[PDB]
């Protein structure tokens, strides 16, 4: 029963509640949460109504309890292994990123063109790089159902389609291209132009 | 007044409307927009009630007129020049990104440690790299926005340096909460939280 726009804030509330927990805060008000997130307290309260919590009275939401609620809903106690497709400027950078404090989110497999110089190599942390033509062979017995897509924009749709045929069910795409994929496939876009336009909008509201 | 959570979608609506316009769609429904964005029609309808005559009906939204609305509210007809601070794995990647079709959003200079090999040089697309100690010298400038891609351990210190030099907004990639003055805006790119969102949605499809 959580609305989709509220669900897109789960992971942000999780981050903030872990911080508040680490800071020894027992009860967090809607205004403190809003301020941390850069939204309005009214949106916070409505959102939290879907998490079982009223926010109109009392001293705040129970930090430990909610933190644990977010952890459970985001499946933060189990591991998700993802593949990275396109090991160029941004893809190579992402191989260096620590996605999770407890390694519950990891890149476990990467792909590039069969002829790319990285193909055949393995990272310091044991992520092999394969050719894209081998993807179906590698995904046969695999636990990976999630891909990060960092190919050139001109190639994103074609590679996305390859991924879905291979069994990928969700894609975190960095290309600024709308992907047309089947309805049961989730695509999450990282759009840094849209992030900067947001930022600038808020900067202009402060002036 | 547009609520802050609605304002965080302006840029997303702008992308969608530019696509619909390019595709020759004259009128869009709340459901078509919601499906594009991956949210609920009801959220779209409420948001658009804050966009004036153009969104009051809750249906048949005029694509060209709303695209123009979003371009105006986002100041998409003028140029924003930004600086990048930290030319490492992700910083160097970003210097290769084309942020805007019409170059209205651009990285115009970058910074690293004074001792970094890239300092004194120019990137592929001819962006100059300077040492962080010289930031206040470089900032007579039109730049009031930074992208922050230093190590996580250095993010707060470098953020403080930016704010002292005159930066008013920071797009941060470090998974570190920054404590800065109220009048400084920080937008956090948090790839962990993006992937958690994606997996939540994937689990809802099963
Ligand atoms: N550069 C950035 O930091 C940044 C930021 C945001 C978005 N983006 C977007 O991310 C995408 C990639 O950008 P980039 O600058 O890293 O591109 P890039 O050109 O450096 O790298 C793309 C990689 O994908 C590989 N590739 C090409 N076809 C492939 C295929 N069929 N299968 C597997 N791999 C294939 C290439 O060999 C290359 O290694 C682009 O759409 C870009 O717009 C980049
Ligand atoms: N690797 C990724 O793709 C990725 C993705 C998401 C988030 N992040 C985050 O982005 C940040 C940077 O990651 P990275 O792997 O690119 O780090 P990195 O160590 O490769 O790069 C950091 C750069 O910052 C420079 N630097 C250090 N102190 C500085 C200072 N005082 N002033 C100016 N420059 C300074 C360094 O010389 C170096 O070039 C980290 O917080 C990381 O968690 C990285
Ligand atoms: Cl949203
Ligand atoms: Mg909302
Ligand atoms: Mg997780
Ligand atoms: Mg090849
Ligand atoms: Mg979505
Ligand atoms: Mg590009
Ligand atoms: Mg653009
Ligand atoms: Mg189910």
Numbering used by the authors:
A (entry chain B): 6 to 212
B (entry chain A): 6 to 144, 146 to 212
Wording from the paper:
In many Gram-positive bacteria, the redox-sensing transcriptional repressor Rex controls central carbon and energy metabolism by sensing the intra cellular balance between the reduced and oxidized forms of nicotinamide adenine dinucleotide; the NADH/NAD+ ratio. Here, we report high-resolution crystal structures and characterization of a Rex ortholog (Gbs1167) in the opportunistic pathogen, Streptococcus agalactiae, also known as group B streptococcus (GBS). Rex is a homodimer consisting of two domains, an N-terminal DNA recognition domain and a C-terminal Rossmann-like dinucleotide-binding and dimerization domain. The dimerization of Rex is stabilized by the swapping of the C-terminal α-helices and the dimer binds to a consensus Rex OPerator (ROP) sequence (TTGTGAAN4TTCACAA) to repress expression of target genes.
The Rex-NAD+ complex crystalized in two different space groups, P21 and P212121. The higher resolution P21 form contained two NAD+ molecules per Rex dimer whereas the P212121 form only contained one NAD+ molecule per dimer. The superimposition of the Rex-NAD+ complex and the DNA bound conformers revealed root-mean-square deviations (RMSD) ranging from 3.1 Å (for NAD1) to 4.0 Å (for NAD2). These changes are confined primarily to rearrangements of the N-terminal DNA binding domain. In order to bind to the ROP the DNA binding domain of one of the subunits of the Rex-NAD+ complex must rotate 26.2o. The rotation leads to an increased distance between the recognition helices (α3) from NAD1 (18 Å), NAD2 (15 Å to 34 Å). Comparisons of the three GBS Rex structures reveal significant inter-domain movement between the nucleotide binding domain and the DNA binding domain. Similar to a proposed model for B. subtilis Rex, binding NAD+ does not lock the protein in the DNA binding conformation, but rather appears to act to increase the rigidity of Rex, thereby limiting the conformational flexibility of the protein and stabilizing the interaction with DNA. The allosteric effect of DNA on NAD+ binding observed in this study of GBS Rex supports this idea.
